[model samples]
Target chain A: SQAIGILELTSIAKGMEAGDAMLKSANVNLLVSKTICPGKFLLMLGGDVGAVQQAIATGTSLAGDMLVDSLVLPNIHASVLPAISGLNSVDKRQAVGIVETWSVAACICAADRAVKASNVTLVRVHMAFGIGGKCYMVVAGDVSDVNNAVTVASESAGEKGLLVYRSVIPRPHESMWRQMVEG
Target chain B: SQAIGILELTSIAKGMEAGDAMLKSANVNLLVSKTICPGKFLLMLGGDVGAVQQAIATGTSLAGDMLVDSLVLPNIHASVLPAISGLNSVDKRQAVGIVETWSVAACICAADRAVKASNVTLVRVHMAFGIGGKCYMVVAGDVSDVNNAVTVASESAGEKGLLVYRSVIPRPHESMWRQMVEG
Candidate 1:
């Protein structure tokens, strides 16, 4: 599902750049393919938040705060792409599945990847940040898998060269939205 | 201030065209230059609401919905095009102080043009689906200017020989964050 969504994002970006960004044959075809996903599904793709945030910083501060245009289509594609083959693989190495637990240090998508790897409906995705920072996400899935995914996500952001702002575990007396809202 | 942001966006669209969506350029300085009395500024650049609806559509979406790179170079050049003498030309009948509007439209700026145009600000600049669907915008000093600018905007999109979207405007009930928070 996300594959189509990701491809659509790639397509939209390409289309925006079709002339100076592009105008070729192969690239055109690549961008034109229909990849659609719908409804509620979690997508987990991994990349450096620093880069994305860098883009955002440039947009708001440097670009006169006119970034809303650049972000909408991608969000639509990203959120909707999960309706298709929810667990297909283009890379062959990556597996697929999902969970949703908001509040995290690294991009929420990172946790989604880990949850999907379990090959089941995940309950939560947790990443390590710190006290006061919502670094963990409690998705819907097996407890053990969620825990392991959390462990993996804590390091992934740093691996991608981002200075993580928080820890994965909540501090004492801190309320977990998952627990308060769900449990 | 908007120089590097727009430049980066234009460049990225060129580089990633084949794999990304079609990118279009809009001007920031043009809109800001023409802006007048500020009421409620609600600009929807682009994107779906994902971050639990609170992430507030990220500003890049605030720029253009689909693929605006969420970043563009600032058109800081708007700051000092000093020497009002160079603005208008009696011989050519060109208008001065209207460069901002031209820039936002990404059109061929001219010598003789709308000189009396005032308080205009390119509040929202974005690229949309197709050539006809593509759009860049500016805010006018008054109702008349906005009305005029919208016509130009519509014409600009149509000039691409494409059927563009009707118009862009603020949502009725929507308010700025400050209003939403402090109000």
Candidate 2:
């Protein structure tokens, strides 16, 4: 079992302050907290579901008008966080899955849940920079695992009104896999 | 003093034509040209006032209706060119000045002027990508130097209707300076 949470804010200064306060409010694990393009701020954390909820509640209160969006996911996937952080290492490429979001916070939260719910191994987390500030992550594993991961991750992002796109490519060509592996 | 010239055009075709003709007409150095938002184009250059004048005359004739706006600063400030490309060394900060603009081009032009008009060090230039697509820069020096830099930079952007905000903090507290450095 796993839980994940994300906080998005309009201003970096407000987001940074709220992120610090949120971590202090709960025993959740802080994964990423930093500024993104267009002067926005994002903070992500995960741990026991109850603690994640508590931390989000504190963050929401502190953020007030500065809050842009937020999410809390219980029973999230295991491989999602590593995939989004681009820290995953998988030697084999059986199948590929992708989850996309309109915001950085939503993408990270959705990715973590996606990986944890299946046997997928994260491939990469491609952040939106020149591509208009959106975020998406890729994962690979058995076809069944890839399918399972994408479904949950896409649904979670859709619930937040941040889902942009989702794809599951079963048995992608060798050339495709080889090129994607480099990224 | 070197004079600077800028040409903002509505079409890339005419922008290129003016860019080529402007440089060929005189010993002016072409700086920036290409697209921004809404598919617009821009070209900037600098040289002696007489050469800049001659270049603009040729550019204007070639640009015709495509030229949106144009400027020729007969006595352009010294610091603007290096600040745009990020080349400056500052020592000992007694104050900090910031110039914020709505466009990348305006931000660069403003920073160069800000640094050239005063005894200031170019700290950094920050750009907003997805959220607002704005730009801003920071400079540090003596209080009077900081004040002078901001004033000129703000006015340069104001001429282009790109000025967003400007701030100057004299004798900033040590803690504030420390935090600013971390950024």
Report lDDT (CA) for all predictions: 0.27, 0.72
Model 2, A1-183: lDDT tens per residue? Answer: 657777877654455456656767777766666566556667777778899999899988877886877788777665555554445787557888878788665776677777667768777776764123588888888988889989998998899788999999988887787556546
TM-score of 1: 0.25
RMSD of 1: 20.3
- DockQ each: 0.02, 0.14
Candidate 1 interface RMSD after superposing interface residues: 16.8
**B73-179: candidate 2 lDDT, tens digit per residue:** 66655555444434345576787776767765677678777767777887766555411357677788888888898899999999988786676766654434543
DockQ (C-alpha) of model 1?
0.02
Docking class of 1: incorrect
Q: Whole-model lDDT, candidate 2? A: 0.72
The segments of candidate 2 whose C-alpha lies over 4 angstroms from its true place after superposition are A1-87, A101-106, A127-134, A158-165, A178-183, B89-97, B102-113, B116-118, B123-133, B140-163, B166-183
Over the stretch B1-183, how does candidate 1's per-residue lDDT look in tens digits?
A: 212222112222332331122123332211111111122121212112222122222234433433333323223234112111112112211111111222323321111112123333443233322111222222324445544544554454355543222222222111121111111
